């Protein structure tokens, strides 16, 4: 019975810039709250303890106050390591023991443009009956980027697929992945595979493709 | 260092039974009292149990309390969840966390958590994931990881020699229903570049080598 | 409306 608003739910900021998350409470909980770090694929991270109280091996980098109702986390000097999903704990009893909606932090880098990649369907997959052909968009930044697929100058649509990796934890980029999926004998039909890549860090379109059977 | 390692995740049947293990080392087990927590896609941490240091003394949550029960054995350092009656609200990374009291201020948090395992609710069947080599014609190079069922699909390069560069790609859900990704590494140019794919909810371990 | 312990401060539920 003890719900817990987490605000704000997303955040961007730069190396070296202070941010504070806030957390509010339904009911007066004294100071048992916790912070925690969260990256993909990884463990949860204990930070704070009991509203103020660093965690040995945390650094000073990191802070929170408040008590009853109303508690705040912050990270002095945001550093590129701190791209992760923050969440708070409240911890008065097993029974009322909840979670932060989290937020997830991403950290503000100069706009990076990708470096474009094409790839051919393997001759295992044709085998099978199934033709992919993958585009890779290496380390850029923002994560918003435009990728289209075009199959001896025709337009694609509704025939694939893209993925976004997390942000990256040295050098803050992201990286994509666009995957066009047709049928072997479609495949076998036309000759030249395009990839056009739009972005904000491209003062002209990038393209890269191949034609079928030749490499 | 101090560490928790879980097992036991895969699909289940709406209404079958599953157990879930974690593993604790580099520390003293026995001394700890033991939580569970989940978490759905897309919503926020769940906590689910609580069991006592000797073990028979637990907590269940209301969403859990006559389904799931929490046990341990000290002797084998793991805790353990036994999963009954599942449902598709039940969909969820699975974590296990170490008890910490802090008697200054007379209070409580999960100085400890594992890297979480998960469990699938579905009356599909699995399916083993086939591994693809993605060759160019700086390089990039990976593998297509297409249709298994159902997550996860962990990746790694030559047995964990090969990191830096690495990308491993969120799954996408085809619309077939089956799941798919891509790995890949971008390496500048006998020095061989093997993907390694673990599927664990079929039992399957394909290992590719891209040329 | 007791309360049932399972660990040292907070790890506690009441009935
Ligand atoms: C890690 O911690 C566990 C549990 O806290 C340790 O087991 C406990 O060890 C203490 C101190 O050695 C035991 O107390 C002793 O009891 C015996 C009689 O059993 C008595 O002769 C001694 O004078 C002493 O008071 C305690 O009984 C025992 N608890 C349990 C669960 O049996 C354990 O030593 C630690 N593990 C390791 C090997 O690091
Ligand atoms: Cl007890
Ligand atoms: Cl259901
Ligand atoms: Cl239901
Ligand atoms: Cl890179
Ligand atoms: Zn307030
Ligand atoms: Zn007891
Ligand atoms: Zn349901
Ligand atoms: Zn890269």
Same mark, same amino acid.
């Given at each position: 019975? %003890?719900?817990?608003?987490?605000?704000?739910?997303?955040?961007?900021?730069?190396?070296?810039?202070?941010?504070?998350?806030?957390?509010?409470?339904?009911?007066?909980?004294?100071?048992?709250?916790?912070?925690?770090?969260?990256?993909?694929?990884?463990?949860?991270? @204990?930070?704070?303890?009991?509203? %103020?109280?660093?965690?040995?091996?945390?650094?000073?980098?990191?802070?929170?106050?408040?008590?009853?109702?109303?508690?705040?986390?912050?990270?002095?000097?945001?550093?590129? =390591?701190?791209?992760?999903?923050?969440?708070?704990?409240?911890?008065?009893?097993?029974? +009322?023991?909840?979670?932060?909606?989290?937020?997830?932090?991403?950290?503000?880098?100069?706009?990076?443009?990708?470096?474009?990649?094409?790839?051919?369907? %393997? +001759? =295992?997959?044709?085998?099978?009956?199934?033709?992919?052909?993958?585009?890779?968009?290496?380390?850029?930044?923002?994560?918003?980027?435009?990728?289209?697929?075009?199959? +001896?100058?025709?337009?694609?649509?509704?025939?694939?697929?893209?993925?976004?990796? =997390?942000?990256?934890?040295?050098?803050?980029?992201?990286?994509?992945?666009?995957?066009?999926? @047709?049928?072997?004998?479609?495949?076998?039909?036309?000759?030249?595979?395009?990839?056009?890549?739009?972005?904000?860090?491209?003062?002209?379109?990038?393209?890269?493709?191949?034609?079928?059977?030749?490499? | 260092?101090?560490?928790?390692?879980?097992?036991?995740?895969?699909?289940?049947?709406?209404?079958? *039974?599953?157990?879930? *293990? &974690?593993?604790?080392?580099?520390?003293?087990? #026995?001394? !700890? $009292?033991?939580?569970?927590?989940?978490?759905?896609?897309?919503?926020?941490?769940?906590?689910?149990?609580?069991?006592?240091?000797?073990?028979?003394?637990?907590?269940?949550?209301?969403?859990?309390?006559?389904?799931?029960?929490?046990?341990?054995?000290? #002797?084998?350092?793991?805790?353990?969840?036994?999963?009954? *009656?599942?449902?598709?609200?039940?969909?969820?990374?699975? !974590?296990?966390?170490?008890?910490?009291?802090?008697?200054?201020?007379?209070?409580?948090?999960?100085?400890?958590?594992?890297?979480?395992?998960?469990?699938?609710?579905?009356?599909?069947?699995?399916?083993?994931?086939?591994?693809?080599?993605?060759?160019?014609?700086?390089?990039?190079?990976?593998?297509?990881?297409?249709?298994?069922?159902?997550?996860? /699909?962990? $990746?790694?390069?030559?047995?964990?020699?090969?990191?830096?560069?690495?990308?491993?790609?969120?799954?996408?859900?085809?619309?077939?229903?089956? !799941?798919?990704?891509?790995?890949?590494?971008? /390496?500048?140019?006998?020095?061989? !570049?093997? &993907?390694?794919?673990?599927?664990?909810?079929?039992?399957?371990? /394909?290992?590719?080598?891209?040329? | 409306?007791?309360?049932?312990?399972?660990?040292?401060?907070?790890?506690?539920?009441?009935?």
């Amino acid at each position: 019975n %003890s719900v817990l608003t987490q605000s704000p739910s997303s955040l961007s900021a730069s190396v070296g810039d202070r941010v504070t998350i806030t957390c509010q409470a339904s009911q007066d909980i004294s100071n048992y709250l916790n912070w925690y770090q969260h990256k993909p694929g990884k463990a949860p991270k @204990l930070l704070i303890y009991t509203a %103020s109280n660093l965690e040995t091996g945390v650094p000073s980098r990191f802070s929170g106050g408040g008590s009853g109702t109303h508690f705040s986390f912050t990270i002095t000097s945001l550093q590129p =390591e701190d791209a992760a999903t923050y969440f708070c704990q409240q911890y008065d009893n097993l029974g +009322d023991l909840s979670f932060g909606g989290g937020t997830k932090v991403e950290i503000k880098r100069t706009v990076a443009a990708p470096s474009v990649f094409i790839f051919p369907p %393997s +001759d =295992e997959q044709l085998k099978s009956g199934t033709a992919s052909v993958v585009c890779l968009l290496n380390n850029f930044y923002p994560r918003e980027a435009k990728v289209q697929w075009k199959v +001896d100058n025709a337009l694609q649509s509704g025939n694939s697929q893209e993925s976004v990796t =997390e942000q990256d934890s040295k050098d803050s980029t992201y990286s994509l992945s666009s995957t066009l999926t @047709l049928s072997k004998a479609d495949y076998e039909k036309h000759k030249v595979y395009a990839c056009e890549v739009t972005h904000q860090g491209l003062s002209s379109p990038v393209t890269k493709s191949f034609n079928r059977g030749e490499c | 260092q101090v560490q928790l390692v879980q097992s036991g995740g895969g699909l289940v049947q709406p209404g079958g *039974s599953l157990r879930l *293990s &974690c593993a604790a080392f580099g520390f003293n087990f #026995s001394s !700890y $009292v033991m939580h569970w927590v989940r978490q759905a896609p897309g919503q926020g941490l769940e906590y689910l149990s609580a069991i006592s240091s000797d073990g028979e003394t637990t907590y269940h949550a209301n969403s859990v309390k006559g389904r799931f029960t929490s046990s341990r054995d000290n #002797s084998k350092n793991t805790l353990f969840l036994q999963m009954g *009656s599942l449902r598709t609200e039940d969909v969820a990374v699975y !974590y296990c966390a170490r008890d910490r009291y802090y008697e200054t201020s007379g209070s409580n948090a999960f100085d400890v958590w594992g890297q979480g395992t998960m469990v699938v609710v579905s009356s599909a069947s699995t399916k083993g994931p086939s591994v693809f080599p993605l060759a160019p014609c700086t390089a990039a190079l990976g593998c297509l990881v297409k249709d298994y069922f159902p997550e996860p /699909v962990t $990746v790694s390069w030559n047995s964990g020699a090969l990191t830096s560069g690495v990308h491993t790609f969120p799954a996408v859900l085809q619309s077939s229903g089956l !799941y798919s990704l891509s790995s890949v590494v971008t /390496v500048p140019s006998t020095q061989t !570049y093997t &993907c390694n794919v673990d599927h664990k909810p079929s039992n399957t371990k /394909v290992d590719k080598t891209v040329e | 409306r007791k309360r049932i312990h399972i660990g040292p401060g907070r790890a506690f539920y009441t009935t």
